[PDB]
Amino acid sequence: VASAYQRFEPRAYLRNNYAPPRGDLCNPNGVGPWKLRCLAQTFATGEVSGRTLIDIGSGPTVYQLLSACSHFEDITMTDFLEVNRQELGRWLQEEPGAFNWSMYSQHACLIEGKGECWQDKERQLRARVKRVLPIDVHQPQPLGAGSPAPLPADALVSAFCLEAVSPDLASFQRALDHITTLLRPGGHLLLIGALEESWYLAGEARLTVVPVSEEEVREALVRSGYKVRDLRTYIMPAHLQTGVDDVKGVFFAWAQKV
Ligand SMILES: Nc1ncnc2c1ncn2[C@@H]1O[C@H](CSCC[C@H](N)C(=O)O)[C@@H](O)[C@H]1O
Ligand SMILES: O=S(=O)(Nc1ccc(Cl)cc1)c1ccc2c(c1)CN[C@@H](CO)C2
């Protein structure tokens, strides 16, 4: 896969998945509103807290941390590709060419209902993201030997990574076992991913993906030593079925390392 990922174009990836129609946040039935709503509700339970958090395979996106950032003062973002870490850098440092996530920040504020202005939410994320490190979930030690990242983390977040870098279920299970080592016992894992997908595009790159089911993800979490606190499925409607992939749904898993 690492080979195919050498052609991965962040801008194309962003455009394919986070720009209209999939990125439209006005229609309450879209995947965008559904996902932000499920990230906000999880953190609103007050049960997912601590000091440090690590986002596994962040790619060029930050939406997965909008609701999470107000609960963890030290946040580590990561990704296998340097081009993605650079794309993140552009938004974090507010440099030219950064992707504009303002509609997402605003919706997270809208959903959270704490009366927070979106600039303050983005300010807080930028402030708490202490570093952006390389990572490889295929390695028993994903971050490596002496990573600047505070370990073990009190919580992990990973969206669309594992199944997208695993050729099969068994390999999926190992990557999960792998990243699980980065988590403090009793800690929390918020895993988001593509259901029954076999490929997706990112510019000249065409990636192979392992198609997994909700049941398969649940059992994998259980086998890695987690207690599944919540599991949800969003079925991808026809209007969101574009030619960028063959994903059937999106899953969300809130797991607790026991
Ligand atoms: N071996 C590996 N270990 C960890 N991440 C990897 C990887 N190989 C590829 N990746 C990264 O996994 C990501 C899958 S796309 C998901 C991006 C983002 N988390 C989102 O929610 O959209 C890409 O950023 C890709 O570079
Ligand atoms: O759900 S999405 O259609 N877009 C989306 C997700 C979250 C929000 Cl907040 C908004 C839009 C979405 C986002 C990323 C990926 C997909 C779908 C499916 N392919 C994966 C890579 O395998 C990558």
Curated annotation (Swiss-Prot):
Catalytic activity of the protein: phenylethanolamine + S-adenosyl-L-methionine = N-methylphenylethanolamine + S-adenosyl-L-homocysteine + H(+); (R)-noradrenaline + S-adenosyl-L-methionine = (R)-adrenaline + S-adenosyl-L-homocysteine + H(+); (R)-normetanephrine + S-adenosyl-L-methionine = (R)-metanephrine + S-adenosyl-L-homocysteine + H(+); (R)-octopamine + S-adenosyl-L-methionine = (R)-synephrine + S-adenosyl-L-homocysteine + H(+)
Residues given in the record as S-adenosyl-L-methionine binding sites: 13, 18, 57-58, 63, 79, 84, 136-137, 159
Chain sites annotated for binding octopamine: 197, 245
CDD domains attached to this UniProt entry: AdoMet_MTases
Outcome when changing residue 197 to A: Reduced enzyme activity towards phenylethanolamine. Decreases affinity for phenylethanolamine 6-fold. Decreases affinity for S-adenosyl-L-methionine 2-fold
Name under which the protein is recorded: Phenylethanolamine N-methyltransferase
GO CC terms: cytosol
Activity regulation (UniProt): Inhibited by methyl methanethiosulfonate, phenylglyoxal, tetranitromethane and diethyl pyrocarbonate. Inhibited by 4-oxo-1,4-dihydro-quinoline-3,7-dicarboxylic acid, 4-(benzo[d][1,3]dioxol-5-ylamino)-4-oxobutanoic acid and 1,4-diaminonaphthalene-2,6-disulfonic acid.
Variant or mutagenesis effect after changing residue 153 to T: No significant effect on protein expression and enzyme activity with octopamine as substrate
Pfam families (alphabetical): NNMT_PNMT_TEMT
Effect of residue 163 to A/Q: Strongly reduced enzyme activity towards phenylethanolamine. Increases affinity for S-adenosyl-L-methionine
Record-stated family: Belongs to the class I-like SAM-binding methyltransferase superfamily. NNMT/PNMT/TEMT family.
Pathway it works in: Catecholamine biosynthesis; (R)-adrenaline biosynthesis; (R)-adrenaline from (R)-noradrenaline: step 1/1
Alphabetical list of SUPFAM superfamilies matching this protein: S-adenosyl-L-methionine-dependent methyltransferases
Functional note: Catalyzes the transmethylation of nonepinephrine (noradrenaline) to form epinephrine (adrenaline), using S-adenosyl-L-methionine as the methyl donor. Other substrates include phenylethanolamine and octopamine. Also methylates normetanephrine.
Record EC number: 2.1.1.28
InterPro entries: NNMT/PNMT/TEMT_CS, NNMT_TEMT_trans, SAM-dep_methyltransferase, SAM-dependent_MTases_sf
Single Gene Ontology MF annotation: phenylethanolamine N-methyltransferase activity
Effect listed in the UniProt record for changing residue 163 to D: Strongly reduced enzyme activity towards phenylethanolamine. Decreases affinity for phenylethanolamine and S-adenosyl-L-methionine 3-fold
Uppermost EC category: transferase
Organism per entry: Homo sapiens
Annotated keywords: Catecholamine biosynthesis, Methyltransferase, Phosphoprotein, S-adenosyl-L-methionine, Transferase
Gene name of this polypeptide: PNMT
